[PDB]
């Protein structure tokens, strides 16, 4: 079994690339599992001071990074050139594990 | 919202101990950031010290002192004809009710003593008797206004 977890930046590339990649295994012919996405990698980090006299608009790390985890079955040589051929969104940091 | 008339008004809660509409706005005002328990406890403890000192209801004395600490003018800065005058403006009900409490809160910290209970209690006694620090500080705001009245007809 080979797992694939593609990420995204602008809240849409995640599915725009999932519905295109996870369907290539079906186009080639094989079974696949449903969607199971992970929220994000957040990793609090806060050490810096500020002017301390005009110090307002309290905000911290507005950002979203979704993950789409789905497995693949029946791995063949023709099933590896599905994503490497083109990466249209430029934000999907896909990793085949 | 701003400069387009008064926005939708927000209600105000009342306390069932004394039953007054001027003993909760002050609480909400003194509820500074992070300080809501100690100040409220001190105010509650001083509300009875004042009742014992003045021998009158904790709210009637304050209602009467609101008029004793009621000013008539407020010094401003209005520039016209190459000169900046201290042209004041007439007092209004709500404006005065707010300014009196603002001055009371600002002068309750004038005394650099440590005892906050005393700082908050002994001031109301003198204010009701006619010698409060707020009553004394309210004199200059009217003196300067009367002095600058020579050019206070522009209604601004």
């Amino acid at each position: 079994k080979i797992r694939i977890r593609l990420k995204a930046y602008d809240h849409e590339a995640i599915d725009a690339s999932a519905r295109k990649i996870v369907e290539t295994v079906t186009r080639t012919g094989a079974s696949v599992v449903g969607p199971v996405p992970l929220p994000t990698e957040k990793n609090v980090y806060c050490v810096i001071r500020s002017p301390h006299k005009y110090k307002d608009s309290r905000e911290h790390f507005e950002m979203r990074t979704h993950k789409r985890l789905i497995d693949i079955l029946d791995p063949t040589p023709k099933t590896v050139d599905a994503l490497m051929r083109i990466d249209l969104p430029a934000s999907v940091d896909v990793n085949i594990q | 919202m701003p400069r387009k008339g008064p926005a939708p008004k927000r209600p105000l809660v009342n306390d069932p101990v004394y039953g007054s509409q001027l003993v909760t706005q002050l609480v909400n005002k003194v509820l500074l950031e992070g300080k809501k328990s100690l100040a409220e406890r001190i105010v509650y403890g001083a509300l009875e010290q004042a009742r014992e000192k003045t021998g009158t209801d904790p709210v009637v004395t304050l209602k009467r002192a609101l008029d004793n600490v009621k000013p008539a003018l407020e010094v401003r800065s209005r520039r016209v004809g190459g000169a900046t005058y201290q042209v004041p403006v007439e007092v209004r009900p709500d404006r005065s009710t707010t300014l009196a409490l603002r001055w009371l809160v600002n002068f309750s910290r004038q005394r650099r003593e440590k005892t906050m209970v005393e700082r908050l209690a002994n001031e109301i006694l003198d204010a009701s008797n006619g010698l409060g620090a707020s009553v004394k500080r309210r004199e200059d705001t009217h003196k300067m206004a009367e002095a600058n009245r020579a050019f206070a007809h522009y209604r601004w």
Binding site: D10, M84, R85, I86, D87, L88, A90 | -
Partner: protein, 210 residues
Amino acid sequence: MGQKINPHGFRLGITTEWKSRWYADKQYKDYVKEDVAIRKLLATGLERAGIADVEIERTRDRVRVDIHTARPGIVIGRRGTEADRIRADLEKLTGKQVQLNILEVKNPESQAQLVAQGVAEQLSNRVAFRRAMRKAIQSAMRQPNVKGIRVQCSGRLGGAEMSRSEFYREGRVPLHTLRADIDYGLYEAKTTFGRIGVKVWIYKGDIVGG
């Protein structure tokens, strides 16, 4: 000129798609180093053929290129002498093979860059700039699939050293709506007395492309 940015880059992330794209881990710099060189070479050589848009993807380090010309027959006169010339030049420049596939667009009158090149050539053709713009608009708006066109020629027109900027529009050309899918083309021409620029916008229709 105000903030009349190219609208083609506003919906490419919602409705339309990107022209060139690839993936590079610590190699984007070296990849663009050759991409810009290929872009300069094509702008120098193939511009005479009427290139519209060069999509430059990247296979496993060898080649992935696609071009959409407008005059099929001039760039390929005799197989080997003209079609393979650019391939050999690119192979000599960059040490990688090139499986160039020259395909033709559905029509030239529907592309923004092609009509831009046409107007730039008509301007240097010494013909009246106004009549040239009118003819270009009429040719491009012969309802192939389009619904609006907007051309703006600026520079030292009229064979003088002045600075004029005409304006013309047809149909609907909304720029504040995402459901437009407007195509834009940029280019600059050089005459015997100065430089000239042309801003073109072609609105086809309200295709949501969900």
